[PDB]
Design a protein around this ligand. Sequence first.
Ligand SMILES: *[C@@H]1O[C@H](CO)[C@@H](O)[C@H](O)[C@H]1NC(C)=O
Ligand SMILES: *[C@@H]1O[C@H](CO)[C@@H](O)[C@H](O)[C@H]1NC(C)=O
Lengths: 50, 49
Amino acid sequence: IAIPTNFSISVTTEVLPVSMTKTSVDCNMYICGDSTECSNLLLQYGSFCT
Amino acid sequence: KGIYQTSNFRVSPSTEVVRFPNITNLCPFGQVFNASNFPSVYAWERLRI
Ligand SMILES: *[C@@H]1O[C@H](CO)[C@@H](O)[C@H](O)[C@H]1NC(C)=O
Ligand SMILES: *[C@@H]1O[C@H](CO)[C@@H](O)[C@H](O)[C@H]1NC(C)=O
């Protein structure tokens, strides 16, 4: 049999993510912008952006 | 109750602003439409306007 006669104390560092960044988007100024000619056309595509 | 992200409804454009170059002369439609003796099709001519 093998039995230790001494010992050592070690400190271990481990990392793991918890959260990401929160983001938000606006369809009416991404798809069109300030163009009111295509705001009414984007209105005809339903409720994807909701 | 809560917090909500709202879209644009407050501000709408009304004023039309237009800027154009200072070109003033009338463009020669007379010498290219009311002319005489246009060439035939195999010897057509270019005109830079
Ligand atoms: C055990 O290890 C420590 C660190 O190296 C040392 O100071 C100590 O003397 C050792 N014990 C024996 C009994 O050798
Ligand atoms: C060119 O215009 C004159 C009058 O300005 C007219 O009498 C003449 O018939 C015209 N030539 C055409 C249309 O080929």
